[model samples]
Target chain A: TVKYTDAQIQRLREYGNGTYEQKVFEDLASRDAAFSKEMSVASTDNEKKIKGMIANPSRHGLTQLMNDIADALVAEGFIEVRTPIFISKDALARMTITEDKPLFKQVFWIDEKRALRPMLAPNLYSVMRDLRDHTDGPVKIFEMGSCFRKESHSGMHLEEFTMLNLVDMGPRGDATEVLKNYISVVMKAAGLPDYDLVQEESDVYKETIDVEINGQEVCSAAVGPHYLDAAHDVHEPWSGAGFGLERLLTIREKYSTVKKGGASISYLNGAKIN
Target chain B: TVKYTDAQIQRLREYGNGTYEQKVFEDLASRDAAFSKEMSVASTDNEKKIKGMIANPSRHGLTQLMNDIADALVAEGFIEVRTPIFISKDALARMTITEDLFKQVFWIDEKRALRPMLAPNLYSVMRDLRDHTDGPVKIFEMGSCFRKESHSGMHLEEFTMLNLVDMGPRGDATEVLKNYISVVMKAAGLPDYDLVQEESDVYKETIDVEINGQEVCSAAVGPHYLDAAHDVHEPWSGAGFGLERLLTIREKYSTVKKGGASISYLNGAKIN
Candidate 1:
């Protein structure tokens, strides 16, 4: 990860506008846009009929599956609630994650009581207040909502995107049940057939996109111990599995047409098909 | 009416916070809440349910009424479509609204082509203060507003709001639609109405709330006019109804019983 400081900006200014670093930045931006447009075309057939279907979540089968999974989690004694996208100042102050006060200064000030939630946790914890009703000893809760992040448009990031957050506070101790249920729910949602879970080096695991492409496998298969150790450092029993919907859909579309490209929907519009 | 010029604030401050004017300002806010609560109880008792069950235009009774009364007078035509909350800077440049110069300062930034509108518009109407169209022309529009607004306890970043504009090529088209305003409001179901011509300086309309022979919900409505003055912080025109206020008013018994007439009175205001 790269961090820029005022000193660096000053140094870059000394190098002037024609500096190689500036060209690199410009190149990075164009590359990101090209990737985004390609992804866009691959997913919704360049924003045609399939695009409408994606926008109208009501008609999407994956949406139904996800909602059903969330409902099942709720029915199984998890808290069924929605956290407000608007958060309180007092709550955000508790986020121990970063040190960007000036970035926060840019937040749209609304009557001092609220700001749009920049992440899901504070609001989730806001709703987790109601977890007092969790007679299930350990309360298991889930939140699926739009999360806002500041982004300058990347192939891998969006200012607003859907996030599924699961919180368990039960005597179950092991988070296995929650993880197992979620993975199964996602697999069912995406209409993927059951696949074997291989234990591999964590770095290999990190490279996996959860779907493969060509014969080269878009998804990495190894689960590295180093990565798992890093997760352990968080000091929580939390286990997380995340895959970008757009990317996974893209890989699946490509994989489906690997051998017989004939009659196969190009990555275009195919990413949206269940 | 209370423009927040530094000069005005200085004058008010010199009068001190305890003066009658200051007290009245405080009282206006406090009494406004008390009055709204009273009206809500009355509305609840009358409507049997506080929610308005508008049937005209079926699904779009609210928007249709706003358009008929406000947009028609301005010749802006009814805003029959909904526009996307985010638009590409290039498309927004086409809109030429001055705020586009600094939209980057906002919480969310938008980039897309063709100013993708969410609500499909079967017909498009352009609005301007300059007289371009001949004769009386009318149009209005109502819909949701989206942004990362705070005030969560009492507000949503996204909420329903409507705009009624009057763009008469000759003069005030609101004059021609006076009776239509009465007709539309009455049709919605309000009676025992009043349309007071507020001085241009007064915040155009006020909703009187009466409960048990005592006035309950009284909100001094202001203007939300569309002009180059968005950055300048000026009132738009007529009444600026907050959605929460409307929701709370729905619970009042008397107002609910008075029904459309109470809401009908909202239609008659025309800013000079």
Candidate 2:
């Protein structure tokens, strides 16, 4: 078994890039020995903590949060629609993510024409249009799935992540109010009591209301019959919001990065569980 | 609005390849009107049923079954893991899927493709989790997996997969796997299934579960596979089951395509 200094373990925990447990494991293995041997050794606080989480893993905090929020949304009349993770180049371009744009650089292309979707907006737009003339009332739909981005490494940036996007189409008025109410519902379900709704400028919507907790942005929402909708021939007024599941958990758990709680390769669930 | 004779509508519904409701809508529209106009027209028994389903879509039966099974598994000490849908080509090859077979994969690029199986990712995750736990670890994953195979009644390009694997601290691999099978089968309301052992290229011993002549689940026990590229270093057993296949078997559907996650059929009913 390998060993770690108290200071080193604390440092790794504080500055963890991935899961809290994994950050400790990797740091110890790098200095002490290979992971295969060091796993059996439990001389340090961090090593013991990792081992404890592994032996009795629980449901991930992110999954729990998702379940609660989904229940709340469904109870409030949101039907979940799962869209494909892949989108064609033409569909992406229709969202104004053309060749020279910054979003284009982040795309994880599958072929000359198709790529892993960077956002749920494109697919949702198509579904909305397809169902627009089919239904009579306001069409309320949402999807929770993975989105890909080729991001340069940052404290909060990840190449792959989960998102929850909800859109209400038809003649529903007060788009901003709808967004605010939904945000509160989601946050309350996540056990968060208070958050600020800050208005900001966005490249996609031109203007947006963002959900912020502890000064970090967790959700972005917009109302539209906007430019992007015009391209797809969806003329009906619509209100929508996109929330990063990882970012939400990160904020709720006070994790250093989004990967720690939700997207970690080393973590199966969350810090408390894995 | 364009109209269809009872005979014509019946024939189209019988031979339709997609959603039953959409088929009726399209057949009517091609006769000179659109879906919107035809929807409000006088309805026949079949048309009325399809329209009702479209207006009030509900949770899929297969999805409900999966949720039930998942809850049961969690109560029995299994942790759920969500891995990436896209996998590297090298990982696929490591699983012993050769070039000829690999051609049937939905390629993202030369280096990556959508995962056709969950085992590769499961193996990788187990190896990582193994390093942290000294006792047995139970993990299960359920998600959408993709393939590029021909779309027949028995096959689909996209499908849902549920896999559960247990590694380390203790227990015989086969017994643990059998217990898991019984637990899931009971939760899914299945009576019983047959387990057949086969000489597989990947696992040292492959045990498959068959119900009513259709093999819906495959269990692989490890001693040989653990030493593969990912170095899982533990005696473990795992199984992968197709959600749609189970639904078809349970409902006695003629084809696997009609069971779950279909646009043509909603909640096990052919509405379109």
Candidate 3:
């Protein structure tokens, strides 16, 4: 049995909560120690990897991962869309994110009427609504962009982060089944296997299927023709999934924080550059 | 002979500042009439193209254009970096932009503002990356930039910008900048353009690429002015280009406002 100090147990408890077994805690503690030591003093194999990357700097690992997912989605008949970062009050209202709502206080407002988009759903719905008037049968679209949300200053939270959303509408039968296929394809593209899909209830979504990797949720999906759609004048049934790329990468690399996987000054790609 | 109305002459004078010939004026009038008619009724070929695109909504033309450029850049040994959209006020100050320019900024708060330009964050990242890495870093960033300007034919509140920098080159920074300008302009499919050296407040010297009398891109080399704030000691060369302006100039569109994500156009054709 690996010896666990009081401090290590406390740290593991904070990281794992009450869900992980004692053996799992031991493994986590050892891994965390290895990572911390490597970042601090460059004494481990991971430390060698960091020094190697710094010696020859290139595109971050996350960039390659995102590109792979994008290409795969395109090959699967999903057209990529780029929407504006600022969303109108009307669009927010259409999504039922109004005053007195929890999302309202978190909004980084540009003006009294428009704010930075906290979610892609509002803009995607608008685009879909417009596309429906113009197109016929089976519209598949996806967008990868930054979404802004005000959160506590912590490792798990980011004021701005990358979101990839793939949505299908019009003549896609069985929304949940299509979403599951998307989840499978996306996970395969990310080189992530051995994940479990769990069903959960949501206040905004009627039902959600979360793809969890080792007790960490990386992606979520929902089927619609729901109330938000009605508000946006979108009556057709649709299915969509959104993945936090940073979270997915963090879970994959077992990073202590999502910041390690994003555009960071301390970490180059997923390795400590400093 | 096509007769021109007084209003048409006035419009042409406004558009061209009365410098165009009779033939050019007549052509402009005819094209303008056709555009107006097609947008209203979808009867012309261009209008049909717009209607067809709407019926089969795929990626926007601008998105495809950007992707092509990105692929080309990556192939040319350029690494793309994405930085935060919200930059701190200290960064703005570091860039020599002051509170007097706050009218031009989209302020998030007293401390943070939406990035008016990508250079500040790029500089920050470069300074940070330099500490760990060696010389000859070629980095590029492409994304949305916000600026508060009068919403008019010539200006947009939000626009896409592509900023590229090739640092640690061996030759004169100006020569490197000139070569890069040629590569990017050719990739953008621009016709003949002139390179002019103009003095500017931002950079000690600015090499501007001008087409049809409008500067589409600005290139500057350093010992950069912002090097002091970040402790960057190396000499570098860089250029910033407005993607919308480039598209507008290439397509011969009168305004950048009509060219992107507009309700009035579909796939870069006027529709409604």
Candidate 4:
């Protein structure tokens, strides 16, 4: 083993940027004094920073992923909408996630009557109802933002995470067909070649198509005009899909945990630390 | 079928600006009237405006504004980064935030707080990137930053913040900061701006960018005292903009609430 004094390991771990941590690099540098010198200088080189900045113009992985997906759907005539982060209790009750439900308890409460929205669907439902009178075609709308859930524990859960929810409401009868088309378009937009669309049970929709990458559930989509539509007074057939942006990124980026690419405290996009 | 009455036709004609048709439709709809007849009127001037409202691909103001600055910086070789919104309390302390301005932070726990500024995270990233990369590190982040609380029509407890830093080899710090300010403000569609040297709670002094007679951006050129804590030794320059505040002046909204994270406004259009 190549020798690592306490200070050497600290610099390697803190300033390595994931490179110097390799055991092979340690051994290579130990055999040669010149090798160690170069490694030490290279570890904190401003020139390297400039090269990375210039050679590869990069974007935050999740943010770019969002822009890509939005461009795809918008091309297919989707209107983007944004609602407030704070939601009313009545809205949650309408979603059938009432005080009695397990998901209801996860809400980050601001007051008795309002809390941070655990999901964007209820607000989207309200907007879709208002939009129904305005558009004659399939009223396609979507929103991308952070949703608050006092989610406990890790690997797959987050306290706050981004979700991109898209819904198309119209008289279209081919719910599953439209859904498959969405899955294909999204996968293409994401530059992802493979995913499993597995049918699953949902608490609210009862039926859903879950988008899984390497067995990880990144998105769950539902087709509606089901019994749930009655609460929002939504009378038309609708197809809606919500993708957890961080989970999608984690699976695509091959991250060990969902929090790695999330709106998190420990990591910035995919980089470690605040 | 209800025909177009003289008063109805005349009233629609009088309703003005880009909001003409939508306003007219709501007024007609209030009485539950079917005014869906062909609204064939006016010249080509209002025709384009009417068509845009029918369905235009409008991103949220803050969203597009964020991407707009990102594009500008990326064009100048500034890699876009997303620093964590929940920064460690130690990171804030490293940035010299210990003064009474410290209480303004939205603390989640003793060890963590919702970041009030992007500086601390930016400093950390630059320090790391400088360690391993072969060239100067230039990076930018545009995201939500939380503060305890403001309003010259200029404050929000939760606000959209954009900060970009050029931590490169060497340049005249003041020149680089002004150049960045030019690039960013021009992308914001307010090329006209002035910079003033002002005292900051963190930096020894900052160059504040002013437009419409108020500060929208504050900049720093460092090798300053805070660098020792962050392990950042490169000559660096950085500027941060309150995106919504800038949007208010660019769009000429009387209040920043018009561009805030509220349902009452969409793409800066008042929903009410």
Which scores higher on lDDT, 1 or 4? 4
DockQ of each: 0.03, 0.24, 0.32, 0.25
> lDDT score, residue B181, model 2?
87
Order of the predicted models by DockQ, top scorer first: 3, 4, 2, 1
| lDDT accuracy of residue B54 in candidate 1 | 13
Evaluated on chain A only, model 4 obtains a TM-score of 0.76
Residue-level lDDT tens digits of model 4 in A214-268? 7667778887667769988888778888888887787666554566665543454
TM-score, per-candidate, Cα-based = 0.39, 0.76, 0.81, 0.74
Worst 10 residues of 3 chain B by lDDT: B12-21
DockQ: the better of candidates 1 and 3:
3
RMSD of 2: 7.4
| Model 3 chain A weakest 10-residue run by lDDT | A16-25
- Please provide, for model 4 over B34-141, each residue's C-alpha lDDT reduced to its tens digit, 9 standing for 90 to 100: 333233332233344323433665566677777888888889888777756567878888877775468676665568776788888777777766654667778888
Chain A vs native chain A, TM-score per candidate? 0.49, 0.78, 0.81, 0.76
Docking class of 1: incorrect
Candidate 3 accuracy as lDDT: 0.70
Best prediction by DockQ: 3
Query: What are the lDDT figures for the candidates, one per model?
Result: 0.35, 0.68, 0.70, 0.69
Measured over the true interface residues after superposition, the C-alpha RMSD of each candidate is 17.4, 4.2, 3.8, 4.4
User: What tens-digit string does per-residue lDDT give for candidate 1 at B1-272?
Assistant: 23233443343322122112332224445645544444454334323211111111021223233334343323323222222233445434443533622332233334432212211110122222112234222333333344432323323444444333333332243343344344434432332345443344443444443423433223333342322322212222222223223332432321221111111111111000
